[PDB]
Design a protein around this nucleic acid. Structure first.
Lengths: 69, 52, 114, 91, 239
RNA sequence: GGUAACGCGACCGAUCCCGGAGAAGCCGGCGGGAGCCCCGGGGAGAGUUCUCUUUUCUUUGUGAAGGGCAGGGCGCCCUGGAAUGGGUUCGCCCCGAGAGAGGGGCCCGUGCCUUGGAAAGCGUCGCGGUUCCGGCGGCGUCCGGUGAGCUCUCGCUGGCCCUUGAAAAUCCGGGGGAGAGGGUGUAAAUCUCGCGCCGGGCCGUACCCAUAUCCGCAGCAGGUCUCCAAGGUGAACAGCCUCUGGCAUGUUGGAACAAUGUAGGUAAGGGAAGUCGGCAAGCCGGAUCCGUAACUUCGGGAUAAGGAUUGGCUCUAAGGGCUGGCAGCCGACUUAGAACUGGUGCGGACCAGGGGAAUCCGACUGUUUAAUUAAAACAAAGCAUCGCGAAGGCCCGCGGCGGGUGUU
RNA sequence: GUGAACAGCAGUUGAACAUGGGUCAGUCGGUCCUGAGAGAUGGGCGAGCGCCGUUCCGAAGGGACGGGCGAUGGCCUCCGUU
């Protein structure tokens, strides 16, 4: 399950021709945003919480978004 | 074969396959477990043929 | 005290059957099968004793898996032979061929006179 | 504290084998396991490794001596007899 | 000892031990090779020695297994042929080398790859010379001296692993391990310690022989047992 | 790219040649890292409460594959030249062929953090559809500390050999430089860099593995190869008791308690007077402290022989680490001595040598008549004769440029 | 499910009897390489089926990057294919 440390690279890894879906865990302390492609589980750990809607909208076009509950 | 079987389930009930596991019983015949596709349906095709 | 078992049908203590523990998410004890301790390379010279510095030591049908530089060091005769014994061969090949040009001149004082 | 009044390495055999073989083993089972000076490097670490086949563990050079000592005795004067028939012929 | 359960134990043993061939080099001039390791072999309490000669018709490196002469060490040079210098572990034919010098791994036929004097502590000294005939005399280990063919060669020195009969083997095991790295041959049972049908010598009340233990050379098998063709017998005094 | 050991994402190219790996014995000593056992405190549920007991038990978690750091090891490179010899291990062992001091570099990194990964798992507390849930909700899933303890691993170092402890499929790294790629363009050959798409057929896979599924004519006290292994007393995988998991006493019940048997004990006084013969039984036994003869191949004899000490509880004395000849705090064992004390009782069961003075036989360890002989027989190291220089000795074979001793 | 027979007394029980289910893999084995050793052909021995021998009385390699002639395939452009 590969990590992404920035906020400008994840989005590209969602725009791929092969990125099948996105899911969005919230557990107190962080918000792990997770995207699946054709090999790994490319996560990302955004510790700031108003940094987690602005992004939540930004997710790329005809994809299958979830929320994890 | 497995390869052989997979087209015979394909070219008589019309239906596309995922995988075809096998084994051989103590009475001595071959029994193939035939997984199916998501767009296809399993109780539904089963009625067509007769097994219900 | 989870006294435990093999998972494969091999229950002799044979060579290819070496193990270690692991605790699961479950909270259970369970064996896992180990992989072979790869030696480091020994150098072509013949004379030097131990093991190489600069080549990933790994059991040898994996050496396919790696990519060039993982299996050498930058240098003439790199990753095959050791650098103490290399520096000797540049010297030796230099001094032997020099002394060779000498004897040609100090054999040639015989047939010049004689 | 001295521990044995006449039995060298051959305390390792006790009462066994009889007196005059234990004397006869003392002269060979002390010389074989000794160290010798490597003439090449100079150090004090020649040492046997099998029957008549010896090894400096510093400059990695390896010699063929005698089974139980580093020169055989008339191989010391086999070298001084071949050296001296290099005198008879060359003139 | 004629087969099956006896035949010599050959697996951990390290090569057959020879000379070089012969060729135009050994035959019209000389060649040089280097020593790369002295090295132990079983069934043979003496050391062998690898020697990288370079092949003189293709790019290559040939590699041989002489019988190591005492005083040899690693790295050292071995120069050989019909000209090569008489010093130690340097091979050249009996034709050439002078009288008095000692030899090892000596040849009998010109070119046969060395059959005489390769066990630990054995020589084959040169005595005399006759150059019409092209023949030579060579005192071998048993007192006698073969007339030999003057183009047949031997490495110089005395054979390695010298002095092995010295030390008393003590324990019976030390035998076993000596004779467990050779052939099925040991804990040897006497002939009087066999029934009437198992050895001709043993049988009856006491443990005597009965018959004299000398026998005709011209016996058959089953009988030619004992002291064979025995020129004399007893404690050997005088000479 | 770096003085350099060597580092960075790729970093062109044939026949030939060189080496690496697959590829190794057994035994001792020491250290690193997991499992397991222990010890003081926190949660949740139990158990016990006549009296006491902040108590006794249960339970308390993170795969592979990837990145990051600890932890271990170097026969790796630089400045630099050391007797008033130095460095250092339990042991060793190291050095003008370059030590101490200083600074770097490479390989393993099965340990801790990270994404995985809490969304599952385990513990408890409470509510639904009687059914037909991988139902739904909550809290919790902590923090500290020791070690010649046991099990697996990983390294470093020493001992032994007339014993030197497998083969090859497969896969890499080099020297060499045959060649190839296109004229500053859109560039070309070319990549052992990252992403992506298509695919892996055949046969075996249940269960017993044994005082019940195998062999012994049977559910036969026989026999038949391995893996994991908790608490208590101990030197201890010994003997005895107990947790986890297991069992119904091994093809029968009930009543009596006679003579014979089979396997256990005990015996007043004498003590081999019994018998072919001390056969059987019994006596001695653990550890601490003293003390020890003949004879000897000097190594043994030797636990010779012969004595004394040993419980319970109340003390004293020595033996360590860490923070900044002294202060503070952190701590797991042992070892010596003194006193009080019981009906002279303490290796309290369990474990656990009878001793001495000679004659012969065989040097010792080792083998041997499975199913009436384990011995003084066999083998053994040591001694001595005998044949033999290969067209050869010894030997196999019905035969052949036959084979064994022999890769001598 | 049954209680006949068998399971050395008994049976509701059973490893008996009678009916009906149950062994799914690229990643866990065999295959694939050699070990002591087994054994064809060339040769030779043999009345004969056959035996001896395994590198020894053998013309034992059926493959390749390129040099060149002339023939395919997709616009014989470029390369597998002879």
């Amino acid at each position: 399950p590969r990590k992404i440390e920035e906020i400008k690279d994840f989005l590209l890894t969602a725009r791929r021709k092969d990125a099948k879906s996105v899911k969005i865990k919230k557990n107190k302390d962080n918000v792990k945003f997770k995207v699946r492609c054709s090999r790994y589980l490319y996560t990302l750990v955004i510790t700031d919480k108003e940094k987690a809607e602005k992004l939540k909208q930004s997710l790329p076009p005809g994809l299958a978004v979830k929320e994890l509950k | 074969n497995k390869h052989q079987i997979k087209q015979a389930v394909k070219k008589l009930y019309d239906i596309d396959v995922a995988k075809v596991n096998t084994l051989i019983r103590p009475d001595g015949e071959k029994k193939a477990y035939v997984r199916l596709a998501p767009d296809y349906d399993a109780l539904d095709v089963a009625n067509k043929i007769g097994i219900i | 005290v989870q006294r435990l078992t093999y998972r494969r049908r091999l229950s002799y203590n044979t060579a290819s059957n070496k193990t270690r523990l692991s605790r699961t998410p479950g909270n259970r004890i369970v064996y896992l099968y180990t992989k072979k301790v790869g030696k480091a390379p020994k150098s072509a010279c013949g004379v030097c004793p131990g093991r190489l510095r600069g080549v990933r030591a790994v059991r040898p049908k994996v050496l396919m898996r790696l990519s060039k530089t993982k299996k050498h060091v930058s240098r003439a005769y790199g990753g095959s032979m050791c650098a103490k014994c290399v520096r000797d061969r540049i010297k030796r090949a230099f001094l032997i061929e020099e002394q060779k040009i000498v004897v040609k001149v100090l054999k040639a004082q015989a047939q010049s006179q004689k | 504290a001295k521990r044995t009044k006449k039995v060298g390495i051959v305390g390792k055999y006790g009462t066994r084998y009889g007196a005059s073989l234990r004397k006869m083993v003392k002269k060979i089972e002390i010389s074989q396991h000794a160290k010798y000076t490597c003439s090449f490097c100079g150090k004090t670490k020649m040492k046997r490794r099998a029957v008549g086949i010896w090894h400096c563990g510093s400059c990695m050079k390896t010699v063929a001596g005698g089974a139980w000592t580093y020169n055989t005795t008339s191989a010391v004067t086999v070298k001084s007899a071949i050296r001296r028939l290099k005198e008879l012929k060359d003139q | 000892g004629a087969g099956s359960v006896f035949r010599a134990h050959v697996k951990h043993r390290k090569g057959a031990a020879r000379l070089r061939a012969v060729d135009f080099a050994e035959r019209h001039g000389y060649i040089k090779g280097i020593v790369k390791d002295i090295i132990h072999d079983p069934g043979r309490g003496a050391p062998l020695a690898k020697v990288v000669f370079r092949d003189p018709y293709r790019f290559k490196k040939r590699t041989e297994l002489f019988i190591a002469a005492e005083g040899i060490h690693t790295g050292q040079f071995v120069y050989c042929g019909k000209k090569a210098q008489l010093n130690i572990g340097n091979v050249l034919p009996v034709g050439t080398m002078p009288e008095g010098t000692i030899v090892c791994c000596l040849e009998e036929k010109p070119g046969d790859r060395g059959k005489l004097a390769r066990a630990s502590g054995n020589y084959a000294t040169v005595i005399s010379h006759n150059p019409e005939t092209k023949k030579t005399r060579v005192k071998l280990p048993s007192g006698s001296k073969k007339v030999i063919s003057s183009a047949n060669r031997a490495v110089v020195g005395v054979v390695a692993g010298g002095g092995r009969i010295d030390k008393p083997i003590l324990k019976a095991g030390r035998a076993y391990h000596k004779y467990k790295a050779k052939r099925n041959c040991w804990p040897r049972v006497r002939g009087v310690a066999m029934n009437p049908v198992e050895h001709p010598f043993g049988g009856g009340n006491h443990q005597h022989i009965g018959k004299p233990s000398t026998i005709r050379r011209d016996a058959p098998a089953g009988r030619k047992v004992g002291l064979i063709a025995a020129r004399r017998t007893g404690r050997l005094r005088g000479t």
